[PDB]
Design a protein around this ligand. Structure first.
Ligand SMILES: [Cl-]
Ligand SMILES: [Cl-]
Ligand SMILES: [Cl-]
Ligand SMILES: [Mg+2]
Ligand SMILES: [Mg+2]
Lengths: 348, 348, 348, 348, 348
C-alpha cells in the first residue's frame, strides 16, 4: 500500500500523509519532487537532507504534526529513535533521527519498539498515543512524555514551550508542557534539576518577566542599579562591549535583542542546528566590532541572575557546570579582586 | 541567429531578450547559467523548472514583460499555449505553458498559430499585438484579451489587476483591465457572470472598500453589528476560531490579514502555484491552533457578503457553486436552525 | 494502483512490468533507481534519457518485449507516438517517442488513440494486439503492422528482420517480417517500392548471399572480374582508399567488415542513433588514413550492384534518389569517360 | 590524522590505503574524486554507491585486498557487517555492507566488535588476522573464517574459490579455501551439508570434471546415453528449448556456455548482484526465442546429476529444497509417467 | 558568431568543428549535451572533464584531428598550453591542458601566444601550421614540432608514432615522426639523447623486432640462452614470478602480453593517465599472485637489453637514471654476487 504516488496524493489533498487512498503523477528531478497539476509541474518538496529524495519526501510527509519536544531536548536526553512517528528537525530541514520504527520501509529497522534491534537504543515514546506508556514500561532504554500523571513513576516537568510544525510556542489552545521520564538498561532514571532555555528569536523577542521588561525598557546603568547587579559584569556579559575590534561578551539572547532594536548586526549560524548553546560569527554593523565564536544562550534573565549570583568569585578562573535542558553546560567564570570579570558558555 | 551566448548578451545588456546581436561567454553548471565578467563568473539564471537549463533560460529571457493576465485566470479559461510569447509563472518560477509557438526552437510546436498542430489547443491571443485579433477570428479554440472594443464580438470585462514582471497591480501608468473573449471549436463563447479574486498578500494587504476599511479598524462585535451580519458565522468563517487545537474557519484573506497585524502565524504553501483557492497548512504561534488544509480565498469583503447572503439556509449541508475568475468554485455550506454554521471553499 | 514501488516489484519479479501487484522499497539518487535486497541497495535502472528518472524507469519497464520494427523504419515512416505501448530505442537507451497513449500518467497525452489530441499525430498500431487494426481504421494519421492480410488494405511487405529486446534478428521461433500500412489525413497511402538495409554490425557481420560470401573470401581483382564490375569504382566505393591522408570511399558496411578482420580501426559515431545511413569519424590504425564524415549503409551487396549497374554513366555529376527503408536516399554519382568516379550516399 | 587528502595520497602511491602519511590535492565534482597530477585533474574514483562520494571513496580505498569469501556466501550466512575491514562488492561497485566497525568515522557504528551496539548484528571475523578468533568467541552473533583448525570449534569446509580484488579464483600461490564458523545468540551453529556453486562466467567458462568435458565436446544424444540420462529432461533443463517463442529450460550455466560458443545471445541481468541463483532476461539471437525470468545456477554438472538422480519421479509436482552455498534453494520438480518434465530453481 | 548551437551544428554536419555557419537546437542536462533529431534528443557529448559541460563540449569539438604527439611526451617536456589548438587527452577524456590561446572565450588566457600573459608558460607550437615557427622564435618558453628542418635550429628526432584521434600509430599515409625543439627563458635548449616507449596495448600487442618475435615464440630457458641473458634476472624482471602470494617482477609490457595470451589477469589502472611509466594493481587469475604497485614500461625489448647490459653488477643497490621519452626515469638496480637481483623502474 506504500507508494511514492500515494504519499504525494496525501500531501496535495490532506497537507500531509493521512493514510488516504489515491495516486497523483510524480516526476523526480534535481533532488526535488514534482507533481503534474493541469499539465504543469508543481514543486512539492526540495530534499535538503543526506537521504534519497523519495525517502526524505516520505519521512517529511509522515512527520509529527502535534506539539513535540524541541530537538535539543531530545538530543540532551540521548534519544536515538522515535516510536512509530517522525520528529522533523526544522532547523536542519531533515528528520531528527537516522532510522525509524514502523514508519518507512526504507528507513525502518523494526515495525514495533519491542523488537530485538531496538534494545540498545533510547526510543522516544509519546504518552498521548495509546499503548506507548505501557511500551515504555517494557522498554530497556527509552524516554517518555505525557500530559498527566503516570502511576508508579516520579515525573520531571519539562519546558513550557514545544515545537508545533517548526513553530516553538507556549500552547494556549493546545498543551505544550509535558512530564518527562527516562529509563536506562531497564532502570528508571531520576532526572536532575535543570534550567530551560526559552527558545526565542531576535526579531520576535518578547519579555517573560518584569526583570526582562525592565531590562529592555530601562538603560544599562539604571537597570544594574535597580537590581543591585554591581560587580557582576553585566555591561560585558549581557550588554556587550563594542568599543574594541573584538566584540566583548554579549552571551544572552536578550542582550542581542535589546541591541538589535537599536542597531542591526550580522549573525552567521555556522552550525545550523538546534542546540542549547548556539555559536555565531557576529559582526556589528554600527561599530565594526566582531567575534568569530560568540556563544549565546537564551535563558530567562532571572534564571541567569540566579546562576551568576550562586557562584564563588575568589578564583581567577574555573569551569562552572550548569544543568540546562537536561544536559550539563560548561561555563567559564573569570574573576578578579572578588568580582566577576566575565562569564560565558563554552563550545560543547 | 538563435544561440545561448546571444540570449545571455541580451540579458546582460538589455535586462531581457531584445533581439540584439552580440555574444558573451557562458558556462553552465549545477542547473545554473553563468557568464564571465572581467574574469569571474556571475550567475545569470538558476533553473527552477523541469526543463533543461539552457531551454528554460531562453524562455525566461523571452518572457512577456507587459501587463498580462494572472496565470490562474489563464488556467481557469483552459489556455494551453500562448501565441508568439512566453507567459512566465512567477509563482512556480517556470513557464506557464509546456510548448511555445514561434519562440524557442526546442519548445516550438509551430511557428505561427494558424498551423495544423495548434487546432486542438486553446491559444492565448493578445489584442495589443498587431494581427493577433485577426488571428483569433481564424482560430478554432482561443482566448483573446484587448484594451478596447472588438467589432462583432461581445466582450467580458476582466479583473482590475494584472501581472507585470510577477508584480500583480492595478495599473495607473499602464492599462491592466482587459476585455476577454473565448472561442471553442470555432464558435465564440459567452463568458458567464463571475467574481474576481483580489490577488492581495498578507504583508502588503490594503483595503479596497469602506467595508474592508471598517473590518480592519473596528472590532469583531462592532463590525458584525454595523453591517447586520448576525447569524452568518463571520466570527468563525472570517475571523477564525483559535480556542481549540483545530483552527476553525478563517477562509478569507482579509481575515488572515487582520490577524497577522496582531499576532504572527505560519503558512505552509504546500501547493505553490497560482490558483483561485489556495490551501495552506496554518499554525498559529500565539495559541497553537492549527489546521492541515485551510482553504483561503481573496474575495472583496462586499462580494463575499453578497454571496453568503444569497443562499438558502434551510438545509443542514449542501454544495454551493460560485463562478470566480471564470471557473466554478465549489463551496460547502453548513446550516443549523436557519443560520449559517460554516461556509468554506473546497479543495478543487 | 500505478506506483513507482509497484513498477519496481514487477521488474524484480517478472523482469519487466507484468501488471502484478506488490511493492518493494525504492531509493532514488543520482538519476539511478535502487532497491533494497537484504540490506543493500541494488541498481535497477540508470536513466540515460532526458526524462525524469522515475518516469523513464516506468517507460523502460513498460517497453515492448515482442519483435518490433527497428526505429529507423518507424522514423522513415514519420511515426511520432505509439498506441498503448512503448518502443524502446536501445541505441539511445531512451524511449523512441516523446509522449505516450494510455501508458504512463506523466507522459500520456491521451488514454485512447481515438481521442481528439491524437488526430494530427502519426500513431503506431500493432495489428498483433486485439482491436488495434480497427483503431488504425479510425485514426486520421497512423502506421499499422500486421503478420497477415487485412481485408481491403493493400499491404507493403516490410524487412525480414525486427528488433527483439534490442536484438535485431530474422526470427525463426518468432515472426519478424510484417505487412506495413500507413494513413495520412484519413487516407491510406500506398507505400513505395523500397530496398531495405540489412542492419548488421561490424563485429558479428555475416554474409547473406553468394556474392557476399565471395566478396569476403575473394581478392579485390578476383571479385571485380568475377561479377564483371570493371569501371564501377568498387576499389574506391566498397573497398576504400587508404593510400592518402584523407580516407577515400568505403561506403558499404561489408567493405568495413572485410577491412576490420585484417586490421582494426576506430569508428566514432558522433550521432548515436538508428538511421538508414550512418555517418562515422573513421581512423585507420594501420595506415593513418582518416575522414571526418564517412557515410556508411548496410545494403545487401547484390542490391547495391543492382543499384549501381542501372545508372547512366554519361554525366559528370548527378544526384540519384533511391528509396531505402521506405525513405528516399540521395546519392552523388560522379562519372568520367564512361565510368563512375564515386557513388556514395549523402550524409542527409 | 584521517583525511580525504591522505586517503588519496595512499591510493596514488600504494594503489590503496596503506596507512602512509602524506596529502595530495583533491577536487570533488559530479560524484567523482579527482587529483591534480602536474596541472590536470585525473579521475581516481567514480562513486557507484548510494553513499556520499568522499565516504565511499574512503571505504573503497580501505577494501580488503586479500582472498575473501564471495558476497553470496556472506549473504547466505546472514552477515550484516565486517570486523575492522571492508568487503567490497565488485558486482555492485559498492561496499557489501552498510556500516563499518573501526574503519571509517562516517560509517562506523563502533570501533570494536565487542561494543554493545554490535551484539544483535552478525559480525564477520577473519581468523587470518590477530585477535579476530577471540573476538568471535566473545561476539553474540558472528561468522568466522579460518585457514586451519580452531581448538574446540567444529569446522565447515567452505568452497574452493574466493574473491581476490574482484577476481574469483581457486588459489595456487594463495589459499582460497577456508573453514567456516557461525554463532547465533552466543551459541555456535552447526553449518549444514551443502553444495557450492562454481562461480564461473559465460565468456571464460572452463570445465572442471570429465563429465563437463564430455558435455561440451559431445552431442546431446551422445552425452545423454553416455551418462545414462534418459528420462531426465536434460534436452530441456540443461540444453534448453529454442523451438518456441518462449524459451524453455536452460537453467545450468554450462548449458549456456555450450550455446554461447555456437551462437551468441543477450543476457539482461535486471538484478545485478551476487547470488546463488541468478535471474536473466534472455534473448536468443539466432532463433528469436526468449524468456523474461530465466533462473540460472552454476553447479558442477556432476553435482546436478547427483541431485536430479535422487528424486522421486512418481509425483506430478513437488517442491525440492537443496542446500547450496549454505542456503536452501527451492526447485520445482515436474514429472509425468515415471520421468521428469522439468526441474528448475525458483527465482527466490 | 561563436555559440553553443553553432558548435553543435558543425559536430553533426562535419563530425567536428569546421568553422561552418548554422545552428541546431541543443538541450543541456546532467552534464551531457543533447540535440533534437526529428523529435527526440540524441546525446552528442558526455562531459568527463572538470570543466563546465558547454565549455568542454566546445574544446572537444575544436580538438586537433591531425597526428599529434602523445600527451606523455608533451608532459615530459613541460608543456602547459597549446598555441591556437586543443590537444585532447583521450586517456582522460579531457583536454590535455587547462587554458587555451585563441580557441575558446571561456578558457582563453590570450588570443595570441605573443601576448604578455603567455611568456612564463611553455607554449606548444605546431610547425605544420603557417606562422607557428615564427611564433616559437618569439616565444620565451615553448616547444615546437616540425616535419622537416628549421634553419639554424638543431633538431631532436622524436618517436616514430603519434596520436591520431586517440589512435597511436606509426603513420603510413601520414607522417607521425617529428623534429622537436624547446625554448626556456628565450634560450633554445638542446634535448637529451633518449629512448622512447613503444606505446603498445596489452590486447593488440605486436612485436617490432626479431628479438621480440623470439620472446613471444620461444620458451624462457630457450630465449635467455639464445640472447645470452644468463645472470640478468629476466625470469623475474620480464617474465615475472607468480609462485608467491606477492607478484614478483613483471615490469616490461611484452612480458605481460606473453602471459596474457596464456591466462588472463586483472589490471587496475588507479592513475588513469598517459605516462612513460605506468603503475597497475595486478591480480593473476590462475595462481592468485598479486601486487598493489606494479611498475610497467613499454620499451623495445632490444632497448631494455641494451640498457640492462651496460650496468655495473658489482654493487648491492644503485639508482640508475635513464632518459626515456625525454625524461629521466629512475631504476632500482639490485645485484648479488656478480649478477643482478632485480632492475625495475620506480613508480615516480
Ligand atoms: Cl485483402
Ligand atoms: Cl579441534
Ligand atoms: Cl638547419
Ligand atoms: Mg549594529
Ligand atoms: Mg499568532
Amino acid at each position: 500500500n506504500m507508494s511514492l504516488e500515494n504519499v504525494a496524493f496525501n500531501v496535495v489533498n490532506k497537507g500531509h500523509f493521512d493514510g488516504q487512498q489515491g495516486e497523483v503523477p510524480v516526476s523526480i528531478i534535481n533532488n526535488t519532487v514534482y507533481t503534474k497539476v493541469d499539465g504543469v509541474d508543481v514543486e512539492l518538496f526540495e530534499n535538503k537532507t543526506t537521504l534519497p529524495v523519495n525517502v526524505a519526501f516520505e519521512l517529511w510527509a509522515k512527520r509529527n504534526i502535534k506539539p513535540v519536544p524541541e530537538v535539543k531536548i531530545l538530543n540532551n536526553l540521548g534519544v536515538d529513535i522515535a516510536a512509530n512517528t517522525v520528529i522533523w528537525d526544522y532547523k536542519r530541514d531533515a528528520p531528527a533521527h537516522i532510522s525509524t520504527i514502523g514508519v518507512c520501509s526504507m528507513t525502518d529497522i523494526a515495525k514495533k519498539p519491542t523488537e530485538t534491534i531496538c534494545a540498545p537504543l533510547t526510543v522516544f515514546f509519546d504518552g498521548r498515543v495509546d499503548g506507548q506508556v505501557d511500551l515504555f514500561r517494557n522498554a530497556r532504554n527509552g524516554v517518555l512524555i505525557t500530559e498527566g500523571s503516570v502511576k508508579g513513576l516520579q515525573p520531571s516537568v519539562g519546558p513550557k514551550q514545544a515545537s508545533l510544525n517548526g513553530v516553538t510556542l507556549i500552547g494556549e489552545a493546545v498543551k505544550t508542557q509535558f512530564n518527562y521520564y527516562k529509563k536506562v538498561d531497564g532502570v528508571v532514571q531520576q532526572l536532575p534539576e535543570t534550567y530551560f532555555t526559552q527558545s526565542r528569536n531576535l526579531q520576535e523577542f518578547k519579555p517573560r518577566s518584569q526583570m526582562e521588561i525592565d531590562f529592555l525598557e530601562l538603560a544599562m546603568d539604571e537597570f544594574i542599579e535597580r537590581y543591585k547587579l554591581e560587580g557582576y559584569a553585566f555591561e560585558h556579559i549581557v550588554y556587550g562591549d563594542f568599543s574594541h575590534s573584538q566584540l566583548g561578551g554579549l552571551h544572552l539572547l536578550i542582550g542581542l535583542a535589546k541591541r538589535f532594536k537599536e542597531s542591526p548586526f550580522e549573525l552567521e549560524d555556522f552550525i545550523p542546528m538546534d542546540s542549547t548553546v548556539k555559536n555565531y560569527f557576529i559582526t556589528d554593523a554600527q561599530t565594526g566590532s566582531s567575534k568569530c565564536v560568540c556563544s549565546v544562550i537564551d535563558l530567562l534573565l532571572d534564571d541567569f541572575v540566579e546562576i551568576i549570583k550562586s557562584q564563588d568569585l575568589s578564583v581567577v578562573s574555573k569551569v562552572v557546570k550548569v544543568t540546562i535542558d537536561y544536559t550539563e553546560i560548561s561555563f567559564m567564570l573569570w574573576c578578579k579582586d572578588g568580582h566577576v570579570e566575565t562569564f560565558y558558555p563554552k563550545l560543547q
